[PDB]
Amino acid sequence: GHMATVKKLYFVPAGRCMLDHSSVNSALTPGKLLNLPVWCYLLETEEGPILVDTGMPESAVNNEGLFNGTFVEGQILPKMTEEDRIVNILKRVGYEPDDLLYIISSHLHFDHAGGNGAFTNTPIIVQRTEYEAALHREEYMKECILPHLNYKIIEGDYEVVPGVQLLYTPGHSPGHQSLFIETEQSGSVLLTIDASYTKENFEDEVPFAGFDPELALSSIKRLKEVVKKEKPIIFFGHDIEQEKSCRVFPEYI
Ligand SMILES: [Zn+2]
Ligand SMILES: [Zn+2]
């Protein structure tokens, strides 16, 4: 259209989040927090720019105690400043919300959809099973399921534009989706998002936080079949070790 690859894939830091280490390895005894990366991804494509995930909600800004008084008190502590609000991140990079062709929500956890309300015109691509879940499960914040946004509800695998494929990967959340991207510079890239927080969750199948761990494992299996075929480079969702070698904005892949 004419391109089969994305021009640039940017990894864009969007604040951080403390979680207990047992969230990355369900076998670990709770009591040590890990300061984990929160990411959004920007895709420059022939048809326009696409943003994958939108960071944390404004209620998390300078509010590590956001989850005090809830069922996750002391287990999740967002590390978010004013600068990490998605509109401010976008403006620094060179975009306004209405510039974006699409938003892709991997899932509607607070660390992935907290910014969604900023995008009131752009279509927001989300799995039906995720949208449905967000309407009632208690792990979902109001900020992540605002009623009148321009949702583009999808079911299962989906091609967003040429070069940008969504892979249905439920388990971590009921409608979680991962990304398989073909880039001009790097070729095949698999962004697991939270279908594996870390390399060991994926390769070693170490269990991690999720709504349905059995499902999460089947999704990992499915991803391994794609990997066997495509031999992509693979990036995990909340991996402090891999983060050490990620190329990040203004670098791209
Ligand atoms: Zn998540
Ligand atoms: Zn996450």
mmCIF file of C-alpha atoms and ligand atoms in Angstrom:
data_model
loop_
_atom_site.group_PDB
_atom_site.id
_atom_site.type_symbol
_atom_site.label_atom_id
_atom_site.label_comp_id
_atom_site.label_asym_id
_atom_site.label_seq_id
_atom_site.Cartn_x
_atom_site.Cartn_y
_atom_site.Cartn_z
ATOM 1 C CA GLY A 1 0.000 0.000 0.000
ATOM 2 C CA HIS A 2 2.548 0.152 -0.672
ATOM 3 C CA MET A 3 4.706 -1.275 2.360
ATOM 4 C CA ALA A 4 4.742 -4.638 4.153
ATOM 5 C CA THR A 5 6.853 -3.469 7.038
ATOM 6 C CA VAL A 6 6.643 -0.760 9.648
ATOM 7 C CA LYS A 7 9.197 2.046 9.182
ATOM 8 C CA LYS A 8 10.076 2.332 12.909
ATOM 9 C CA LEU A 9 9.232 0.541 16.121
ATOM 10 C CA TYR A 10 9.975 2.693 19.227
ATOM 11 C CA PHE A 11 10.072 1.395 22.786
ATOM 12 C CA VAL A 12 8.848 4.353 24.896
ATOM 13 C CA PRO A 13 9.273 4.245 28.667
ATOM 14 C CA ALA A 14 6.019 5.290 30.365
ATOM 15 C CA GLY A 15 6.853 5.301 34.029
ATOM 16 C CA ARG A 16 7.362 2.321 36.280
ATOM 17 C CA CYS A 17 5.512 0.095 38.693
ATOM 18 C CA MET A 18 6.597 -1.729 41.828
ATOM 19 C CA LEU A 19 5.309 -5.301 42.128
ATOM 20 C CA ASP A 20 6.207 -8.008 44.572
ATOM 21 C CA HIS A 21 8.702 -10.459 43.080
ATOM 22 C CA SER A 22 6.204 -13.251 43.401
ATOM 23 C CA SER A 23 4.342 -11.557 40.504
ATOM 24 C CA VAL A 24 7.263 -12.531 38.172
ATOM 25 C CA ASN A 25 7.754 -15.971 39.672
ATOM 26 C CA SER A 26 4.697 -17.275 41.544
ATOM 27 C CA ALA A 27 6.976 -19.610 43.545
ATOM 28 C CA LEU A 28 8.880 -16.850 45.281
ATOM 29 C CA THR A 29 7.893 -16.032 48.874
ATOM 30 C CA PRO A 30 6.434 -12.512 48.984
ATOM 31 C CA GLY A 31 8.354 -9.642 50.588
ATOM 32 C CA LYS A 32 10.670 -7.994 48.000
ATOM 33 C CA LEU A 33 9.414 -5.458 45.554
ATOM 34 C CA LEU A 34 10.756 -5.007 42.022
ATOM 35 C CA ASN A 35 10.674 -1.688 40.220
ATOM 36 C CA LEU A 36 9.451 -2.857 36.805
ATOM 37 C CA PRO A 37 9.290 -0.949 33.527
ATOM 38 C CA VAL A 38 5.984 0.232 32.073
ATOM 39 C CA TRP A 39 6.058 0.514 28.302
ATOM 40 C CA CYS A 40 4.241 1.947 25.417
ATOM 41 C CA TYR A 41 5.260 1.352 21.792
ATOM 42 C CA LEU A 42 5.064 3.723 18.880
ATOM 43 C CA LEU A 43 4.862 2.374 15.365
ATOM 44 C CA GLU A 44 5.554 4.624 12.386
ATOM 45 C CA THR A 45 3.695 3.017 9.439
ATOM 46 C CA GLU A 46 2.787 3.931 5.911
ATOM 47 C CA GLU A 47 -0.792 4.649 7.002
ATOM 48 C CA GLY A 48 0.235 6.637 10.041
ATOM 49 C CA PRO A 49 1.437 6.332 13.595
ATOM 50 C CA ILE A 50 0.073 3.682 15.910
ATOM 51 C CA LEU A 51 0.387 3.662 19.688
ATOM 52 C CA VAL A 52 0.452 0.404 21.611
ATOM 53 C CA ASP A 53 -0.774 0.933 25.183
ATOM 54 C CA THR A 54 -1.185 4.253 26.978
ATOM 55 C CA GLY A 55 0.560 4.092 30.395
ATOM 56 C CA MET A 56 -0.937 4.652 33.814
ATOM 57 C CA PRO A 57 -3.903 6.770 34.908
ATOM 58 C CA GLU A 58 -3.563 10.367 36.193
ATOM 59 C CA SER A 59 -4.678 9.012 39.640
ATOM 60 C CA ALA A 60 -1.246 7.278 39.822
ATOM 61 C CA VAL A 61 0.730 10.532 39.328
ATOM 62 C CA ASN A 62 2.811 11.124 42.469
ATOM 63 C CA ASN A 63 0.644 8.561 44.209
ATOM 64 C CA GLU A 64 2.533 5.386 45.080
ATOM 65 C CA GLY A 65 -0.286 4.645 47.549
ATOM 66 C CA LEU A 66 -2.946 4.514 44.826
ATOM 67 C CA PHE A 67 -3.958 0.946 45.857
ATOM 68 C CA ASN A 68 -4.027 1.570 49.591
ATOM 69 C CA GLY A 69 -7.295 0.348 51.053
ATOM 70 C CA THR A 70 -7.798 -2.230 48.248
ATOM 71 C CA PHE A 71 -7.072 -5.935 47.766
ATOM 72 C CA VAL A 72 -3.652 -5.200 46.255
ATOM 73 C CA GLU A 73 -2.447 -2.767 48.952
ATOM 74 C CA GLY A 74 1.397 -2.884 49.174
ATOM 75 C CA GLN A 75 1.578 -5.302 46.241
ATOM 76 C CA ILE A 76 1.330 -2.724 43.438
ATOM 77 C CA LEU A 77 2.842 0.772 43.739
ATOM 78 C CA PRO A 78 2.852 2.878 40.574
ATOM 79 C CA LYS A 79 5.934 5.029 39.988
ATOM 80 C CA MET A 80 4.570 7.772 37.803
ATOM 81 C CA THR A 81 5.348 11.483 37.547
ATOM 82 C CA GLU A 82 3.534 14.217 35.593
ATOM 83 C CA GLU A 83 6.003 13.635 32.763
ATOM 84 C CA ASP A 84 4.802 9.981 32.364
ATOM 85 C CA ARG A 85 1.239 10.938 31.433
ATOM 86 C CA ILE A 86 0.726 9.673 27.908
ATOM 87 C CA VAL A 87 -0.280 13.086 26.472
ATOM 88 C CA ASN A 88 2.882 14.603 27.801
ATOM 89 C CA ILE A 89 4.985 11.675 26.522
ATOM 90 C CA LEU A 90 3.348 12.028 23.119
ATOM 91 C CA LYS A 91 3.829 15.792 22.963
ATOM 92 C CA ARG A 92 7.536 15.417 23.779
ATOM 93 C CA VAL A 93 7.927 12.833 20.953
ATOM 94 C CA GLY A 94 5.996 14.974 18.515
ATOM 95 C CA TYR A 95 2.342 13.916 18.505
ATOM 96 C CA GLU A 96 -1.138 14.909 19.788
ATOM 97 C CA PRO A 97 -3.811 12.244 20.433
ATOM 98 C CA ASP A 98 -5.778 13.042 17.289
ATOM 99 C CA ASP A 99 -2.621 12.431 15.188
ATOM 100 C CA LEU A 100 -2.728 8.669 15.912
ATOM 101 C CA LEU A 101 -4.188 6.257 13.377
ATOM 102 C CA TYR A 102 -4.990 3.683 16.037
ATOM 103 C CA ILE A 103 -4.470 2.840 19.672
ATOM 104 C CA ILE A 104 -3.899 -0.869 20.380
ATOM 105 C CA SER A 105 -4.732 -1.931 23.946
ATOM 106 C CA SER A 106 -2.830 -5.163 24.688
ATOM 107 C CA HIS A 107 -5.177 -5.421 27.653
ATOM 108 C CA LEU A 108 -6.985 -3.099 30.087
ATOM 109 C CA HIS A 109 -4.814 -3.385 33.175
ATOM 110 C CA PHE A 110 -4.055 0.014 34.704
ATOM 111 C CA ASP A 111 -0.510 -0.014 33.467
ATOM 112 C CA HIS A 112 -1.611 -0.446 29.897
ATOM 113 C CA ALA A 113 -4.876 1.448 29.495
ATOM 114 C CA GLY A 114 -4.692 4.138 32.182
ATOM 115 C CA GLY A 115 -4.198 6.738 29.411
ATOM 116 C CA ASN A 116 -7.065 5.624 27.208
ATOM 117 C CA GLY A 117 -9.324 8.490 28.079
ATOM 118 C CA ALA A 118 -6.975 10.891 26.361
ATOM 119 C CA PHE A 119 -7.941 9.409 22.981
ATOM 120 C CA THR A 120 -11.532 10.314 22.276
ATOM 121 C CA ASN A 121 -11.510 10.164 18.504
ATOM 122 C CA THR A 122 -8.849 7.561 17.626
ATOM 123 C CA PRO A 123 -10.132 3.993 17.348
ATOM 124 C CA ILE A 124 -8.992 1.881 20.270
ATOM 125 C CA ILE A 125 -8.432 -1.746 19.230
ATOM 126 C CA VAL A 126 -9.269 -4.114 22.103
ATOM 127 C CA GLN A 127 -10.307 -7.752 22.405
ATOM 128 C CA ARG A 128 -13.948 -8.421 23.127
ATOM 129 C CA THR A 129 -13.104 -10.759 25.979
ATOM 130 C CA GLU A 130 -10.927 -8.063 27.546
ATOM 131 C CA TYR A 131 -13.578 -5.333 27.171
ATOM 132 C CA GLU A 132 -16.167 -7.702 28.672
ATOM 133 C CA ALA A 133 -13.929 -8.547 31.604
ATOM 134 C CA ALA A 134 -13.219 -4.881 32.303
ATOM 135 C CA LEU A 135 -16.873 -4.193 32.706
ATOM 136 C CA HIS A 136 -16.956 -6.279 35.973
ATOM 137 C CA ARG A 137 -13.759 -7.757 37.387
ATOM 138 C CA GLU A 138 -12.370 -5.859 40.351
ATOM 139 C CA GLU A 139 -8.770 -5.624 39.046
ATOM 140 C CA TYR A 140 -10.086 -3.052 36.504
ATOM 141 C CA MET A 141 -10.029 0.614 37.151
ATOM 142 C CA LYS A 142 -12.761 2.967 35.859
ATOM 143 C CA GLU A 143 -10.051 4.883 34.026
ATOM 144 C CA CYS A 144 -9.404 1.787 31.848
ATOM 145 C CA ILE A 145 -12.972 1.174 30.662
ATOM 146 C CA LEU A 146 -14.465 4.630 29.977
ATOM 147 C CA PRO A 147 -17.793 4.244 28.256
ATOM 148 C CA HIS A 148 -17.735 6.617 25.316
ATOM 149 C CA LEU A 149 -14.374 6.154 23.713
ATOM 150 C CA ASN A 150 -14.184 5.035 20.080
ATOM 151 C CA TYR A 151 -13.674 1.309 20.683
ATOM 152 C CA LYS A 152 -12.844 -0.980 17.798
ATOM 153 C CA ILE A 153 -13.695 -4.291 19.380
ATOM 154 C CA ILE A 154 -11.990 -7.308 17.773
ATOM 155 C CA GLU A 155 -12.191 -11.069 18.362
ATOM 156 C CA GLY A 156 -9.033 -13.169 17.988
ATOM 157 C CA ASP A 157 -6.122 -12.601 15.699
ATOM 158 C CA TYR A 158 -6.202 -9.439 13.625
ATOM 159 C CA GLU A 159 -4.180 -7.521 11.083
ATOM 160 C CA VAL A 160 -4.125 -3.837 11.995
ATOM 161 C CA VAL A 161 -2.159 -2.583 8.975
ATOM 162 C CA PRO A 162 0.423 -4.446 6.870
ATOM 163 C CA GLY A 163 3.309 -5.383 9.175
ATOM 164 C CA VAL A 164 1.278 -5.176 12.381
ATOM 165 C CA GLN A 165 -0.410 -8.353 13.528
ATOM 166 C CA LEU A 166 -2.252 -8.973 16.788
ATOM 167 C CA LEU A 167 -2.050 -12.460 18.319
ATOM 168 C CA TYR A 168 -4.709 -13.474 20.806
ATOM 169 C CA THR A 169 -2.904 -14.509 23.936
ATOM 170 C CA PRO A 170 -5.387 -14.750 26.839
ATOM 171 C CA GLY A 171 -4.441 -15.915 30.338
ATOM 172 C CA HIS A 172 -2.626 -13.069 31.981
ATOM 173 C CA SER A 173 -5.938 -11.244 31.439
ATOM 174 C CA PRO A 174 -9.111 -12.617 29.825
ATOM 175 C CA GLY A 175 -8.487 -10.897 26.503
ATOM 176 C CA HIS A 176 -4.850 -10.235 26.458
ATOM 177 C CA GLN A 177 -3.152 -9.803 23.000
ATOM 178 C CA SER A 178 0.429 -9.755 21.860
ATOM 179 C CA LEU A 179 1.981 -8.142 18.772
ATOM 180 C CA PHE A 180 3.892 -9.586 15.861
ATOM 181 C CA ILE A 181 5.526 -6.766 13.932
ATOM 182 C CA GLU A 182 7.602 -6.743 10.774
ATOM 183 C CA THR A 183 10.019 -3.780 10.791
ATOM 184 C CA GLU A 184 12.132 -2.372 7.965
ATOM 185 C CA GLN A 185 15.305 -2.490 10.101
ATOM 186 C CA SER A 186 14.917 -5.680 12.009
ATOM 187 C CA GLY A 187 12.374 -7.938 10.354
ATOM 188 C CA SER A 188 10.202 -10.064 12.595
ATOM 189 C CA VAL A 189 9.565 -8.823 16.175
ATOM 190 C CA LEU A 190 7.379 -10.463 18.801
ATOM 191 C CA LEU A 191 6.191 -8.149 21.577
ATOM 192 C CA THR A 192 4.765 -10.610 24.105
ATOM 193 C CA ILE A 193 3.444 -7.824 26.293
ATOM 194 C CA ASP A 194 2.158 -9.541 29.424
ATOM 195 C CA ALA A 195 1.800 -12.981 27.880
ATOM 196 C CA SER A 196 5.215 -13.256 29.641
ATOM 197 C CA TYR A 197 6.555 -10.660 32.070
ATOM 198 C CA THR A 198 10.076 -12.010 31.727
ATOM 199 C CA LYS A 199 12.265 -14.238 29.515
ATOM 200 C CA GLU A 200 11.976 -17.064 32.104
ATOM 201 C CA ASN A 201 8.205 -16.889 32.086
ATOM 202 C CA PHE A 202 8.397 -17.550 28.358
ATOM 203 C CA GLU A 203 11.314 -19.895 27.868
ATOM 204 C CA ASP A 204 11.157 -21.754 31.173
ATOM 205 C CA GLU A 205 7.408 -21.406 31.649
ATOM 206 C CA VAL A 206 7.923 -20.018 35.121
ATOM 207 C CA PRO A 207 4.413 -19.057 36.378
ATOM 208 C CA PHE A 208 3.591 -15.331 36.927
ATOM 209 C CA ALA A 209 0.669 -13.128 37.794
ATOM 210 C CA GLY A 210 -2.408 -13.803 35.781
ATOM 211 C CA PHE A 211 -6.137 -14.307 35.736
ATOM 212 C CA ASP A 212 -5.857 -17.915 34.390
ATOM 213 C CA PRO A 213 -2.384 -19.443 34.584
ATOM 214 C CA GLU A 214 -3.401 -22.612 32.615
ATOM 215 C CA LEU A 215 -4.594 -20.378 29.778
ATOM 216 C CA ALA A 216 -1.503 -18.224 30.040
ATOM 217 C CA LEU A 217 0.580 -21.359 29.537
ATOM 218 C CA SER A 218 -1.378 -22.363 26.418
ATOM 219 C CA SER A 219 -0.824 -18.909 25.062
ATOM 220 C CA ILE A 220 2.904 -19.219 25.638
ATOM 221 C CA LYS A 221 2.799 -22.554 23.786
ATOM 222 C CA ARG A 222 1.044 -20.956 20.889
ATOM 223 C CA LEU A 223 3.624 -18.149 20.818
ATOM 224 C CA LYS A 224 6.403 -20.762 20.800
ATOM 225 C CA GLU A 225 4.884 -22.248 17.640
ATOM 226 C CA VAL A 226 4.940 -18.822 16.015
ATOM 227 C CA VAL A 227 8.522 -18.425 17.124
ATOM 228 C CA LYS A 228 9.542 -21.747 15.625
ATOM 229 C CA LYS A 229 8.136 -20.573 12.268
ATOM 230 C CA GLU A 230 9.130 -16.901 12.231
ATOM 231 C CA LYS A 231 12.264 -16.801 14.325
ATOM 232 C CA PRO A 232 11.574 -13.286 15.617
ATOM 233 C CA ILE A 233 13.404 -11.157 18.094
ATOM 234 C CA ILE A 234 11.362 -11.293 21.254
ATOM 235 C CA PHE A 235 10.630 -8.599 23.904
ATOM 236 C CA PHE A 236 8.896 -9.287 27.189
ATOM 237 C CA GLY A 237 6.469 -7.219 29.118
ATOM 238 C CA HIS A 238 8.025 -6.321 32.462
ATOM 239 C CA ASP A 239 11.571 -7.695 32.384
ATOM 240 C CA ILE A 240 14.176 -5.700 34.428
ATOM 241 C CA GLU A 241 16.981 -7.846 32.954
ATOM 242 C CA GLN A 242 16.011 -7.406 29.319
ATOM 243 C CA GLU A 243 15.359 -3.733 29.856
ATOM 244 C CA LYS A 244 19.109 -3.363 30.464
ATOM 245 C CA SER A 245 19.746 -4.007 26.776
ATOM 246 C CA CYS A 246 16.620 -2.659 25.048
ATOM 247 C CA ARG A 247 17.098 0.121 22.591
ATOM 248 C CA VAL A 248 14.616 2.840 23.642
ATOM 249 C CA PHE A 249 13.394 6.138 22.237
ATOM 250 C CA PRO A 250 14.905 7.951 20.344
ATOM 251 C CA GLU A 251 16.450 4.690 19.060
ATOM 252 C CA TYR A 252 14.167 2.327 17.217
ATOM 253 C CA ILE A 253 14.125 -1.148 15.736
HETATM 254 ZN ZN ZN B 1 -1.225 -6.856 32.845
HETATM 255 ZN ZN ZN B 2 1.537 -5.004 32.580
#
